[PDB]
Point group: C3
Chain length 113, copies 3
């Protein structure tokens, strides 16, 4: 894109997630397996947070599975949605809100690096 | 139901999750795809938190997949468990603990709404 | 093993997750359904935190699904990765980093126990 995370919108003040759409029209089938969908949105994330990509319920019920994805605080690449058609052919129109990004606190530990 | 989240119980003081059961007896097969299971439990959530629905390991190993679900802080509807039979026929008895609700902090950002 | 969580490493300072490998060579197929992979790493977790097991994207794209798993703060058993081959035969070499553990804050509520 390259657009940053600050450009994403949350649907309501109580909404935990920032909505993510695919930039492309994509058709998915079960036998295709996991596919990485492009968003045109780029890390990195606010200080001391990491990101979690999760599906929206509406889209899940429609047979599109979003695999939970961890976004590191310092990742500066494109944020892609890992998705699979569950049972049937799923068609993703450009600009449909497929997933959501949740920001979570990044806990410090003494683990080696 | 309508019952609130305060009515849920956690199995041990160290348990991260509040246990969720289905109110109905339900049979699930792989070709059915994602099904929304009723809990009779309703949002909303404590201030400055959001909720995450996740599966229990025992139930996962038994072939019932729970799709991660985000519950918004201000959602006042019924909390439903999005589930799928993975490989085989899964039978869910009324009152079996199928999923768990985790409460997480809702981080404030300057994202447009 | 028994090794504690403090022995795990994080790949970069910005990495949210602690990397998890299987201790065994394992072959997985779709018809096998969910399998619990041994890590040789044991709870419990730092005070006031709980753990979440999630997949790595690279491994997900390769057709290995990791089911999100909650680790309770006071769990003192072995941390196992719940996994399934999605579409094809997946082979897991001993010592490949399959999953990651994320630490999250454990919120106190007045829920009965
Ligand atoms: O597993 C789930 C996921 C979502 N919801 C409810 C709570 C959410 O705030 C609301 C809207 O979800 P989305 O379609 O925007 O994901 O649906 C559930 O009951 N269970
Ligand atoms: O992916 C997982 C999920 C759970 N557990 C362990 C830690 C939990 O505290 C314990 C009990 O899990 P449940 O059956 O209640 O989900 O199992 C794992 O090792 N890996
Ligand atoms: O759904 C996902 C999961 C991961 N990533 C990006 C951000 C991560 O920091 C980076 C590396 O992920 P891993 O392979 O280590 O999981 O990939 C995504 O864009 N989408």
């Amino acid at each position: 894109q390259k657009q940053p995370i600050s450009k994403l919108t949350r649907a309501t003040p109580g909404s935990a997630g920032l909505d993510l759409c695919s930039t492309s029209h994509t058709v998915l089938t079960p036998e295709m397996g996991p596919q990485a969908l492009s968003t045109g949105i780029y890390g990195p994330l606010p200080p001391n947070t990491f990101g979690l990509i999760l599906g929206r319920s509406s889209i899940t019920m429609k047979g599109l599975q979003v695999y939970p994805g961890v976004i590191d605080n310092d990742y500066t690449g494109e944020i892609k949605i890992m998705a699979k058609a569950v049972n049937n052919i799923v068609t993703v129109s450009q600009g449909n809100r497929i997933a959501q990004l949740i920001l979570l606190p990044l806990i410090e530990t003494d683990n080696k690096v």
